[PDB]
């Protein structure tokens, strides 16, 4: 008893401070800096604000309730506590779904994400998500929908006792489906499509830079300047195609301008060149692609890091909250399987998850620099 009452208190307090500190840093980095201020970062700010509300008005009260013997704030301020608890989870999972949809709308069809998905549209989307979550969270709790249809619990709904959820079958199933299981399917499908499509765009650019290496390696330094025209004609077309398909747009466009100019110098205007400049210009092309791989690999690595960073967050959320939501479905199909010991523990797993988001953000170099220049 003596060891538990202090160890649990220390653990919960450390979790509270970790959640508040991390989410405050994540919010401040977006809200104060200018380098990282975009629609995806606006959605990140919405998620961080939801998790901050979870760490402020949900986690400490649940910790006090589990640490103490009974509620203390009254029969009211317990409906609000549960409402805010459900709202934070719903507005986190739906914000994650919006993030996945956004990262699908900016990898599949660009030139529209920079024209329609503006700051005003991002604000509208996050407001819509928050209002939808509020409508599906507060309204059932604030009235008789969440009440249980049996008399053992009714003692804990009044007379200033208890704050346990006491799930009723209909509301439990409806909330576990609408709030979590519906967003967790659209979310997973959309993000899996994003990963299936991102590889394709990388593959399209990789092969465009393959039809140049074998072109340069095989045809240029063999013979018959006539076919050097054929290789260079193929080289120009593939270079132009890659050029046709954030400093990325500026840097890549100017980079391909140099490559095309070098290609034209290799094509010359007084042909029969053979050795005097066709091979000499070919060697310079070898420097160009050797100095382009560095930029191209850096960008591909950055995207495969940025996407996997969001993949970890969308994976950490599932691996933390799904164990709880797979138990709520058990409590309705057949009771007496789980007592109120691992139900609290599995629930508290999702509570801890609110602090894992800022640590995952530190993996991204863009966020890490903002964190360092803020502490
Ligand atoms: C289905 C359970 C209620 C619920 C619905 C949607 C999101 C989260 C939900 O519950 C997770 C915890 O917030 C429960 N909170 C009470 C204190 C147990």
mmCIF file of C-alpha atoms and ligand atoms in Angstrom:
data_model
loop_
_atom_site.group_PDB
_atom_site.id
_atom_site.type_symbol
_atom_site.label_atom_id
_atom_site.label_comp_id
_atom_site.label_asym_id
_atom_site.label_seq_id
_atom_site.Cartn_x
_atom_site.Cartn_y
_atom_site.Cartn_z
ATOM 1 C CA UNK A 1 0.000 0.000 0.000
ATOM 2 C CA UNK A 2 2.711 2.465 1.007
ATOM 3 C CA UNK A 3 4.868 1.774 -2.056
ATOM 4 C CA UNK A 4 1.970 1.740 -4.533
ATOM 5 C CA UNK A 5 0.348 5.011 -3.434
ATOM 6 C CA UNK A 6 3.606 6.886 -4.044
ATOM 7 C CA UNK A 7 4.846 5.004 -7.118
ATOM 8 C CA UNK A 8 1.574 5.408 -8.999
ATOM 9 C CA UNK A 9 1.429 9.081 -8.044
ATOM 10 C CA UNK A 10 4.982 9.668 -9.251
ATOM 11 C CA UNK A 11 4.309 7.840 -12.528
ATOM 12 C CA UNK A 12 1.095 9.755 -13.238
ATOM 13 C CA UNK A 13 2.644 13.118 -12.327
ATOM 14 C CA UNK A 14 5.685 12.480 -14.524
ATOM 15 C CA UNK A 15 3.342 11.495 -17.361
ATOM 16 C CA UNK A 16 1.340 14.708 -16.861
ATOM 17 C CA UNK A 17 4.447 16.893 -17.012
ATOM 18 C CA UNK A 18 5.835 14.987 -20.005
ATOM 19 C CA UNK A 19 2.580 15.355 -21.951
ATOM 20 C CA UNK A 20 2.192 19.052 -21.150
ATOM 21 C CA UNK A 21 5.836 19.880 -21.888
ATOM 22 C CA UNK A 22 5.993 17.973 -25.172
ATOM 23 C CA UNK A 23 2.669 19.211 -26.517
ATOM 24 C CA UNK A 24 3.437 22.798 -25.481
ATOM 25 C CA UNK A 25 6.749 22.619 -27.342
ATOM 26 C CA UNK A 26 5.076 21.132 -30.430
ATOM 27 C CA UNK A 27 2.389 23.834 -30.436
ATOM 28 C CA UNK A 28 4.908 26.632 -29.816
ATOM 29 C CA UNK A 29 7.225 25.504 -32.617
ATOM 30 C CA UNK A 30 4.418 25.810 -35.172
ATOM 31 C CA UNK A 31 2.881 28.934 -33.629
ATOM 32 C CA UNK A 32 6.107 30.976 -33.372
ATOM 33 C CA UNK A 33 8.452 29.822 -36.139
ATOM 34 C CA UNK A 34 7.992 30.600 -39.833
ATOM 35 C CA UNK A 35 10.026 27.806 -41.463
ATOM 36 C CA UNK A 36 7.491 25.166 -40.355
ATOM 37 C CA UNK A 37 4.076 26.775 -40.915
ATOM 38 C CA UNK A 38 1.889 24.881 -43.382
ATOM 39 C CA UNK A 39 -1.360 22.945 -43.700
ATOM 40 C CA UNK A 40 0.208 19.678 -42.537
ATOM 41 C CA UNK A 41 1.743 21.555 -39.613
ATOM 42 C CA UNK A 42 -1.664 23.120 -38.900
ATOM 43 C CA UNK A 43 -3.142 19.625 -38.617
ATOM 44 C CA UNK A 44 -0.181 18.663 -36.420
ATOM 45 C CA UNK A 45 -1.011 21.669 -34.235
ATOM 46 C CA UNK A 46 -4.635 20.534 -33.994
ATOM 47 C CA UNK A 47 -3.524 17.044 -32.945
ATOM 48 C CA UNK A 48 -1.089 18.501 -30.405
ATOM 49 C CA UNK A 49 -3.818 20.748 -28.986
ATOM 50 C CA UNK A 50 -6.171 17.776 -28.638
ATOM 51 C CA UNK A 51 -3.480 15.779 -26.841
ATOM 52 C CA UNK A 52 -2.669 18.801 -24.654
ATOM 53 C CA UNK A 53 -6.328 19.009 -23.626
ATOM 54 C CA UNK A 54 -6.140 15.284 -22.865
ATOM 55 C CA UNK A 55 -3.063 15.842 -20.700
ATOM 56 C CA UNK A 56 -4.582 18.846 -18.906
ATOM 57 C CA UNK A 57 -8.260 18.093 -18.261
ATOM 58 C CA UNK A 58 -8.352 14.291 -18.589
ATOM 59 C CA UNK A 59 -5.148 12.598 -17.438
ATOM 60 C CA UNK A 60 -4.732 14.301 -14.009
ATOM 61 C CA UNK A 61 -8.376 13.766 -13.046
ATOM 62 C CA UNK A 62 -8.274 10.094 -14.007
ATOM 63 C CA UNK A 63 -5.012 9.741 -12.094
ATOM 64 C CA UNK A 64 -6.601 11.318 -9.015
ATOM 65 C CA UNK A 65 -9.672 9.088 -9.324
ATOM 66 C CA UNK A 66 -7.616 5.897 -9.603
ATOM 67 C CA UNK A 67 -5.254 7.047 -6.826
ATOM 68 C CA UNK A 68 -8.004 8.123 -4.415
ATOM 69 C CA UNK A 69 -10.989 6.035 -3.306
ATOM 70 C CA UNK A 70 -13.813 7.980 -4.977
ATOM 71 C CA UNK A 71 -14.632 11.124 -6.931
ATOM 72 C CA UNK A 72 -14.260 14.535 -5.294
ATOM 73 C CA UNK A 73 -15.466 17.239 -7.724
ATOM 74 C CA UNK A 74 -19.157 16.300 -7.516
ATOM 75 C CA UNK A 75 -21.697 14.553 -9.697
ATOM 76 C CA UNK A 76 -21.172 17.314 -12.238
ATOM 77 C CA UNK A 77 -17.698 18.080 -13.605
ATOM 78 C CA UNK A 78 -17.715 14.316 -14.165
ATOM 79 C CA UNK A 79 -19.986 14.392 -17.200
ATOM 80 C CA UNK A 80 -17.732 17.166 -18.514
ATOM 81 C CA UNK A 81 -14.625 15.125 -17.690
ATOM 82 C CA UNK A 82 -15.900 12.087 -19.594
ATOM 83 C CA UNK A 83 -17.110 14.283 -22.463
ATOM 84 C CA UNK A 84 -13.702 15.936 -22.823
ATOM 85 C CA UNK A 85 -12.022 12.527 -22.522
ATOM 86 C CA UNK A 86 -14.027 11.122 -25.435
ATOM 87 C CA UNK A 87 -13.680 14.370 -27.404
ATOM 88 C CA UNK A 88 -9.880 14.301 -27.209
ATOM 89 C CA UNK A 89 -9.688 10.749 -28.573
ATOM 90 C CA UNK A 90 -12.207 11.447 -31.339
ATOM 91 C CA UNK A 91 -10.552 14.715 -32.401
ATOM 92 C CA UNK A 92 -7.170 12.973 -32.378
ATOM 93 C CA UNK A 93 -8.170 10.011 -34.540
ATOM 94 C CA UNK A 94 -10.180 12.150 -36.967
ATOM 95 C CA UNK A 95 -7.317 14.653 -37.182
ATOM 96 C CA UNK A 96 -5.020 11.740 -38.031
ATOM 97 C CA UNK A 97 -7.459 10.675 -40.756
ATOM 98 C CA UNK A 98 -7.460 14.243 -42.091
ATOM 99 C CA UNK A 99 -3.647 14.172 -42.066
ATOM 100 C CA UNK A 100 -3.635 10.961 -44.105
ATOM 101 C CA UNK A 101 -6.139 12.422 -46.579
ATOM 102 C CA UNK A 102 -4.021 15.580 -46.852
ATOM 103 C CA UNK A 103 -0.847 13.597 -47.528
ATOM 104 C CA UNK A 104 -2.824 11.763 -50.210
ATOM 105 C CA UNK A 105 -4.026 15.023 -51.792
ATOM 106 C CA UNK A 106 -0.463 16.399 -51.943
ATOM 107 C CA UNK A 107 1.288 13.347 -53.445
ATOM 108 C CA UNK A 108 -1.395 12.248 -55.910
ATOM 109 C CA UNK A 109 -2.583 15.553 -57.430
ATOM 110 C CA UNK A 110 -0.236 18.478 -56.738
ATOM 111 C CA UNK A 111 -0.801 21.991 -58.155
ATOM 112 C CA UNK A 112 -4.151 21.787 -56.341
ATOM 113 C CA UNK A 113 -2.987 21.273 -52.750
ATOM 114 C CA UNK A 114 -1.118 24.585 -53.138
ATOM 115 C CA UNK A 115 -4.172 26.334 -54.638
ATOM 116 C CA UNK A 116 -7.140 24.943 -52.657
ATOM 117 C CA UNK A 117 -5.607 23.706 -49.376
ATOM 118 C CA UNK A 118 -4.739 27.162 -48.089
ATOM 119 C CA UNK A 119 -4.536 28.296 -44.466
ATOM 120 C CA UNK A 120 -8.216 29.280 -44.485
ATOM 121 C CA UNK A 121 -9.229 25.870 -45.841
ATOM 122 C CA UNK A 122 -7.059 24.126 -43.236
ATOM 123 C CA UNK A 123 -8.743 26.161 -40.495
ATOM 124 C CA UNK A 124 -12.151 25.253 -41.932
ATOM 125 C CA UNK A 125 -11.239 21.554 -42.025
ATOM 126 C CA UNK A 126 -9.932 21.450 -38.449
ATOM 127 C CA UNK A 127 -12.992 23.376 -37.252
ATOM 128 C CA UNK A 128 -15.254 20.893 -39.041
ATOM 129 C CA UNK A 129 -13.384 17.985 -37.444
ATOM 130 C CA UNK A 130 -13.669 19.520 -33.977
ATOM 131 C CA UNK A 131 -17.389 20.285 -34.371
ATOM 132 C CA UNK A 132 -18.085 16.763 -35.657
ATOM 133 C CA UNK A 133 -16.171 15.252 -32.735
ATOM 134 C CA UNK A 134 -17.996 17.519 -30.292
ATOM 135 C CA UNK A 135 -21.371 16.576 -31.758
ATOM 136 C CA UNK A 136 -20.582 12.846 -31.551
ATOM 137 C CA UNK A 137 -18.912 13.140 -28.117
ATOM 138 C CA UNK A 138 -20.589 15.681 -25.824
ATOM 139 C CA UNK A 139 -24.211 15.195 -26.891
ATOM 140 C CA UNK A 140 -24.463 11.462 -26.007
ATOM 141 C CA UNK A 141 -22.704 12.031 -22.674
ATOM 142 C CA UNK A 142 -24.628 15.174 -21.682
ATOM 143 C CA UNK A 143 -27.958 13.270 -21.665
ATOM 144 C CA UNK A 144 -29.533 9.847 -21.191
ATOM 145 C CA UNK A 145 -27.850 7.993 -24.086
ATOM 146 C CA UNK A 146 -24.840 6.705 -22.129
ATOM 147 C CA UNK A 147 -26.900 5.535 -19.133
ATOM 148 C CA UNK A 148 -26.829 1.795 -18.454
ATOM 149 C CA UNK A 149 -30.017 -0.284 -18.514
ATOM 150 C CA UNK A 150 -29.465 -2.089 -15.205
ATOM 151 C CA UNK A 151 -29.916 -1.186 -11.558
ATOM 152 C CA UNK A 152 -26.482 -1.975 -10.090
ATOM 153 C CA UNK A 153 -24.894 0.995 -11.869
ATOM 154 C CA UNK A 154 -27.715 3.460 -11.118
ATOM 155 C CA UNK A 155 -26.316 3.774 -7.591
ATOM 156 C CA UNK A 156 -23.136 5.196 -9.150
ATOM 157 C CA UNK A 157 -24.982 7.645 -11.434
ATOM 158 C CA UNK A 158 -26.243 9.702 -8.473
ATOM 159 C CA UNK A 159 -25.959 10.097 -4.665
ATOM 160 C CA UNK A 160 -22.442 11.541 -5.175
ATOM 161 C CA UNK A 161 -20.687 8.230 -5.858
ATOM 162 C CA UNK A 162 -18.607 6.733 -8.680
ATOM 163 C CA UNK A 163 -17.514 8.057 -12.066
ATOM 164 C CA UNK A 164 -16.990 4.775 -13.921
ATOM 165 C CA UNK A 165 -18.273 4.707 -17.496
ATOM 166 C CA UNK A 166 -20.728 1.794 -17.061
ATOM 167 C CA UNK A 167 -21.129 1.212 -20.790
ATOM 168 C CA UNK A 168 -24.551 0.390 -22.177
ATOM 169 C CA UNK A 169 -24.582 -1.933 -25.174
ATOM 170 C CA UNK A 170 -26.027 0.396 -27.815
ATOM 171 C CA UNK A 171 -23.954 3.468 -26.960
ATOM 172 C CA UNK A 172 -20.779 1.433 -26.454
ATOM 173 C CA UNK A 173 -21.067 -0.223 -29.870
ATOM 174 C CA UNK A 174 -22.109 2.992 -31.620
ATOM 175 C CA UNK A 175 -19.263 5.047 -30.147
ATOM 176 C CA UNK A 176 -16.620 2.354 -30.650
ATOM 177 C CA UNK A 177 -17.681 2.139 -34.299
ATOM 178 C CA UNK A 178 -18.249 5.789 -35.238
ATOM 179 C CA UNK A 179 -15.532 7.453 -33.166
ATOM 180 C CA UNK A 180 -12.660 4.979 -33.568
ATOM 181 C CA UNK A 181 -13.313 1.987 -35.832
ATOM 182 C CA UNK A 182 -14.635 4.083 -38.742
ATOM 183 C CA UNK A 183 -11.707 6.567 -38.813
ATOM 184 C CA UNK A 184 -9.219 3.737 -38.222
ATOM 185 C CA UNK A 185 -10.275 2.033 -41.476
ATOM 186 C CA UNK A 186 -10.335 5.073 -43.765
ATOM 187 C CA UNK A 187 -7.080 6.151 -42.110
ATOM 188 C CA UNK A 188 -5.321 2.831 -42.725
ATOM 189 C CA UNK A 189 -6.598 2.459 -46.292
ATOM 190 C CA UNK A 190 -5.648 6.025 -47.246
ATOM 191 C CA UNK A 191 -2.179 5.796 -45.721
ATOM 192 C CA UNK A 192 -1.530 2.401 -47.321
ATOM 193 C CA UNK A 193 -2.510 3.922 -50.667
ATOM 194 C CA UNK A 194 -0.133 6.821 -49.955
ATOM 195 C CA UNK A 195 2.722 4.379 -49.354
ATOM 196 C CA UNK A 196 1.747 2.364 -52.442
ATOM 197 C CA UNK A 197 1.789 5.535 -54.580
ATOM 198 C CA UNK A 198 4.891 7.234 -53.137
ATOM 199 C CA UNK A 199 7.055 4.326 -54.290
ATOM 200 C CA UNK A 200 5.610 4.715 -57.791
ATOM 201 C CA UNK A 201 6.637 8.374 -58.060
ATOM 202 C CA UNK A 202 10.121 7.485 -56.822
ATOM 203 C CA UNK A 203 10.225 4.587 -59.295
ATOM 204 C CA UNK A 204 9.168 6.888 -62.146
ATOM 205 C CA UNK A 205 12.044 9.263 -61.402
ATOM 206 C CA UNK A 206 14.496 6.426 -60.719
ATOM 207 C CA UNK A 207 13.948 4.790 -64.118
ATOM 208 C CA UNK A 208 14.147 8.166 -65.885
ATOM 209 C CA UNK A 209 17.607 8.353 -64.302
ATOM 210 C CA UNK A 210 18.270 4.769 -65.373
ATOM 211 C CA UNK A 211 17.618 5.342 -69.093
ATOM 212 C CA UNK A 212 20.472 7.862 -68.868
ATOM 213 C CA UNK A 213 23.128 5.812 -67.064
ATOM 214 C CA UNK A 214 23.049 2.860 -69.471
ATOM 215 C CA UNK A 215 22.742 5.370 -72.310
ATOM 216 C CA UNK A 216 25.909 7.123 -71.128
ATOM 217 C CA UNK A 217 27.846 4.031 -70.056
ATOM 218 C CA UNK A 218 27.275 1.886 -73.148
ATOM 219 C CA UNK A 219 26.807 4.054 -76.238
ATOM 220 C CA UNK A 220 28.895 7.190 -75.641
ATOM 221 C CA UNK A 221 32.314 5.572 -75.203
ATOM 222 C CA UNK A 222 32.081 2.895 -77.915
ATOM 223 C CA UNK A 223 32.133 4.232 -81.517
ATOM 224 C CA UNK A 224 30.075 5.596 -84.408
ATOM 225 C CA UNK A 225 29.191 9.200 -83.531
ATOM 226 C CA UNK A 226 25.982 8.551 -85.484
ATOM 227 C CA UNK A 227 24.627 6.486 -82.579
ATOM 228 C CA UNK A 228 25.995 9.119 -80.193
ATOM 229 C CA UNK A 229 23.268 11.282 -81.714
ATOM 230 C CA UNK A 230 20.777 8.494 -80.984
ATOM 231 C CA UNK A 231 21.937 8.209 -77.371
ATOM 232 C CA UNK A 232 21.974 11.986 -76.917
ATOM 233 C CA UNK A 233 18.575 12.314 -78.608
ATOM 234 C CA UNK A 234 17.282 9.766 -76.104
ATOM 235 C CA UNK A 235 19.227 11.557 -73.364
ATOM 236 C CA UNK A 236 17.609 14.920 -74.130
ATOM 237 C CA UNK A 237 14.084 13.473 -74.190
ATOM 238 C CA UNK A 238 14.528 11.664 -70.869
ATOM 239 C CA UNK A 239 16.096 14.769 -69.321
ATOM 240 C CA UNK A 240 13.194 16.901 -70.562
ATOM 241 C CA UNK A 241 10.628 14.396 -69.273
ATOM 242 C CA UNK A 242 12.147 14.432 -65.783
ATOM 243 C CA UNK A 243 12.209 18.240 -65.832
ATOM 244 C CA UNK A 244 8.492 18.368 -66.660
ATOM 245 C CA UNK A 245 7.684 15.989 -63.794
ATOM 246 C CA UNK A 246 9.469 24.523 -50.761
ATOM 247 C CA UNK A 247 12.817 24.926 -52.540
ATOM 248 C CA UNK A 248 12.403 21.599 -54.369
ATOM 249 C CA UNK A 249 10.595 23.123 -57.352
ATOM 250 C CA UNK A 250 13.120 25.943 -57.754
ATOM 251 C CA UNK A 251 16.266 23.881 -57.154
ATOM 252 C CA UNK A 252 15.249 20.965 -59.377
ATOM 253 C CA UNK A 253 14.100 23.197 -62.243
ATOM 254 C CA UNK A 254 17.395 25.105 -62.358
ATOM 255 C CA UNK A 255 19.312 21.843 -62.025
ATOM 256 C CA UNK A 256 17.659 20.400 -65.123
ATOM 257 C CA UNK A 257 18.327 23.633 -67.017
ATOM 258 C CA UNK A 258 22.071 23.005 -66.705
ATOM 259 C CA UNK A 259 21.683 19.351 -67.707
ATOM 260 C CA UNK A 260 19.722 20.242 -70.849
ATOM 261 C CA UNK A 261 22.300 22.870 -71.796
ATOM 262 C CA UNK A 262 25.119 20.359 -71.360
ATOM 263 C CA UNK A 263 23.136 17.897 -73.482
ATOM 264 C CA UNK A 264 22.718 20.454 -76.274
ATOM 265 C CA UNK A 265 26.458 21.194 -76.215
ATOM 266 C CA UNK A 266 26.986 17.452 -76.667
ATOM 267 C CA UNK A 267 24.559 17.498 -79.605
ATOM 268 C CA UNK A 268 26.618 20.364 -81.104
ATOM 269 C CA UNK A 269 25.850 22.189 -84.348
ATOM 270 C CA UNK A 270 28.854 20.989 -86.412
ATOM 271 C CA UNK A 271 28.454 17.213 -86.330
ATOM 272 C CA UNK A 272 30.889 14.347 -86.990
ATOM 273 C CA UNK A 273 32.279 15.330 -83.593
ATOM 274 C CA UNK A 274 33.294 11.836 -82.459
ATOM 275 C CA UNK A 275 36.102 12.466 -79.982
ATOM 276 C CA UNK A 276 36.773 16.211 -79.877
ATOM 277 C CA UNK A 277 33.683 17.208 -77.903
ATOM 278 C CA UNK A 278 31.166 14.333 -77.862
ATOM 279 C CA UNK A 279 33.274 12.336 -75.402
ATOM 280 C CA UNK A 280 34.381 15.491 -73.571
ATOM 281 C CA UNK A 281 30.789 16.643 -73.059
ATOM 282 C CA UNK A 282 29.854 13.090 -72.064
ATOM 283 C CA UNK A 283 32.388 13.204 -69.222
ATOM 284 C CA UNK A 284 30.845 16.432 -67.918
ATOM 285 C CA UNK A 285 27.458 14.698 -67.868
ATOM 286 C CA UNK A 286 29.024 12.112 -65.558
ATOM 287 C CA UNK A 287 29.800 14.943 -63.134
ATOM 288 C CA UNK A 288 26.239 16.277 -63.411
ATOM 289 C CA UNK A 289 24.510 13.027 -62.442
ATOM 290 C CA UNK A 290 27.144 12.381 -59.765
ATOM 291 C CA UNK A 291 26.286 15.819 -58.352
ATOM 292 C CA UNK A 292 22.528 15.264 -58.798
ATOM 293 C CA UNK A 293 22.238 11.919 -56.975
ATOM 294 C CA UNK A 294 23.182 13.716 -53.753
ATOM 295 C CA UNK A 295 20.240 16.115 -54.060
ATOM 296 C CA UNK A 296 17.852 13.446 -55.360
ATOM 297 C CA UNK A 297 18.730 10.876 -52.690
ATOM 298 C CA UNK A 298 18.452 13.556 -49.999
ATOM 299 C CA UNK A 299 14.941 14.488 -51.130
ATOM 300 C CA UNK A 300 13.809 10.863 -51.451
ATOM 301 C CA UNK A 301 15.293 10.044 -48.042
ATOM 302 C CA UNK A 302 13.621 13.127 -46.553
ATOM 303 C CA UNK A 303 10.208 12.098 -47.899
ATOM 304 C CA UNK A 304 10.642 8.469 -46.829
ATOM 305 C CA UNK A 305 11.558 9.868 -43.397
ATOM 306 C CA UNK A 306 8.750 12.440 -43.215
ATOM 307 C CA UNK A 307 6.198 9.879 -44.389
ATOM 308 C CA UNK A 308 7.518 7.212 -42.013
ATOM 309 C CA UNK A 309 7.475 9.754 -39.178
ATOM 310 C CA UNK A 310 3.752 10.206 -39.794
ATOM 311 C CA UNK A 311 3.505 6.447 -40.266
ATOM 312 C CA UNK A 312 4.927 5.903 -36.787
ATOM 313 C CA UNK A 313 2.443 8.359 -35.252
ATOM 314 C CA UNK A 314 -0.448 6.724 -37.093
ATOM 315 C CA UNK A 315 0.988 3.400 -35.914
ATOM 316 C CA UNK A 316 1.653 4.386 -32.312
ATOM 317 C CA UNK A 317 -1.950 5.576 -31.985
ATOM 318 C CA UNK A 318 -3.312 2.240 -33.205
ATOM 319 C CA UNK A 319 -0.991 0.092 -31.084
ATOM 320 C CA UNK A 320 -1.931 2.086 -27.961
ATOM 321 C CA UNK A 321 -5.694 2.631 -28.301
ATOM 322 C CA UNK A 322 -6.798 -0.499 -30.183
ATOM 323 C CA UNK A 323 -6.131 -2.709 -27.106
ATOM 324 C CA UNK A 324 -8.641 -0.585 -25.191
ATOM 325 C CA UNK A 325 -11.239 -0.486 -27.971
ATOM 326 C CA UNK A 326 -10.913 -4.234 -28.543
ATOM 327 C CA UNK A 327 -11.895 -4.669 -24.883
ATOM 328 C CA UNK A 328 -14.986 -2.426 -24.959
ATOM 329 C CA UNK A 329 -16.462 -4.717 -27.620
ATOM 330 C CA UNK A 330 -15.832 -7.653 -25.269
ATOM 331 C CA UNK A 331 -17.722 -6.005 -22.388
ATOM 332 C CA UNK A 332 -20.962 -5.980 -24.420
ATOM 333 C CA UNK A 333 -20.817 -9.395 -26.112
ATOM 334 C CA UNK A 334 -20.096 -11.127 -22.781
ATOM 335 C CA UNK A 335 -19.268 -9.624 -19.386
ATOM 336 C CA UNK A 336 -17.301 -11.077 -16.419
ATOM 337 C CA UNK A 337 -14.313 -11.639 -18.738
ATOM 338 C CA UNK A 338 -12.460 -8.481 -17.632
ATOM 339 C CA UNK A 339 -12.570 -6.932 -14.165
ATOM 340 C CA UNK A 340 -11.877 -3.269 -13.430
ATOM 341 C CA UNK A 341 -8.097 -3.748 -13.214
ATOM 342 C CA UNK A 342 -6.823 -4.305 -16.760
ATOM 343 C CA UNK A 343 -9.669 -2.186 -18.120
ATOM 344 C CA UNK A 344 -8.088 0.740 -16.272
ATOM 345 C CA UNK A 345 -4.600 -0.350 -17.348
ATOM 346 C CA UNK A 346 -5.511 -0.801 -21.018
ATOM 347 C CA UNK A 347 -7.404 2.496 -20.955
ATOM 348 C CA UNK A 348 -4.373 4.218 -19.436
ATOM 349 C CA UNK A 349 -2.251 2.943 -22.335
ATOM 350 C CA UNK A 350 -4.006 5.415 -24.620
ATOM 351 C CA UNK A 351 -3.589 8.082 -21.948
ATOM 352 C CA UNK A 352 0.198 7.637 -22.105
ATOM 353 C CA UNK A 353 0.095 7.879 -25.911
ATOM 354 C CA UNK A 354 -0.601 11.620 -25.655
ATOM 355 C CA UNK A 355 3.065 12.093 -24.714
ATOM 356 C CA UNK A 356 4.613 9.927 -27.439
ATOM 357 C CA UNK A 357 3.746 12.339 -30.266
ATOM 358 C CA UNK A 358 6.377 15.043 -29.512
ATOM 359 C CA UNK A 359 9.159 12.456 -29.189
ATOM 360 C CA UNK A 360 8.314 11.039 -32.619
ATOM 361 C CA UNK A 361 8.366 14.587 -34.006
ATOM 362 C CA UNK A 362 11.961 14.979 -32.797
ATOM 363 C CA UNK A 363 12.891 12.245 -35.284
ATOM 364 C CA UNK A 364 12.166 14.670 -38.124
ATOM 365 C CA UNK A 365 15.169 17.023 -38.506
ATOM 366 C CA UNK A 366 12.892 19.984 -39.264
ATOM 367 C CA UNK A 367 11.147 19.641 -35.899
ATOM 368 C CA UNK A 368 14.345 18.838 -33.986
ATOM 369 C CA UNK A 369 15.991 22.121 -35.002
ATOM 370 C CA UNK A 370 12.867 24.025 -33.950
ATOM 371 C CA UNK A 371 12.898 22.242 -30.584
ATOM 372 C CA UNK A 372 16.591 22.972 -30.011
ATOM 373 C CA UNK A 373 16.265 26.652 -30.970
ATOM 374 C CA UNK A 374 13.361 26.940 -28.500
ATOM 375 C CA UNK A 375 14.764 25.317 -25.340
HETATM 376 C C1 LIG B 1 -16.250 3.385 -25.972
HETATM 377 C C2 LIG B 1 -15.731 3.893 -24.894
HETATM 378 C C3 LIG B 1 -15.824 5.384 -24.663
HETATM 379 C C4 LIG B 1 -14.914 6.122 -25.615
HETATM 380 C C5 LIG B 1 -15.359 6.489 -26.840
HETATM 381 C C6 LIG B 1 -14.545 7.155 -27.697
HETATM 382 C C7 LIG B 1 -13.276 7.443 -27.335
HETATM 383 C C8 LIG B 1 -12.824 7.085 -26.112
HETATM 384 C C9 LIG B 1 -13.644 6.421 -25.259
HETATM 385 O O1 LIG B 1 -13.180 6.054 -24.013
HETATM 386 C C10 LIG B 1 -11.806 6.100 -23.899
HETATM 387 C C11 LIG B 1 -11.617 6.662 -22.527
HETATM 388 O O2 LIG B 1 -11.649 8.031 -22.708
HETATM 389 C C12 LIG B 1 -12.827 6.369 -21.682
HETATM 390 N N1 LIG B 1 -12.883 7.426 -20.734
HETATM 391 C C13 LIG B 1 -13.578 6.923 -19.606
HETATM 392 C C14 LIG B 1 -13.007 7.664 -18.419
HETATM 393 C C15 LIG B 1 -13.305 5.436 -19.529
#
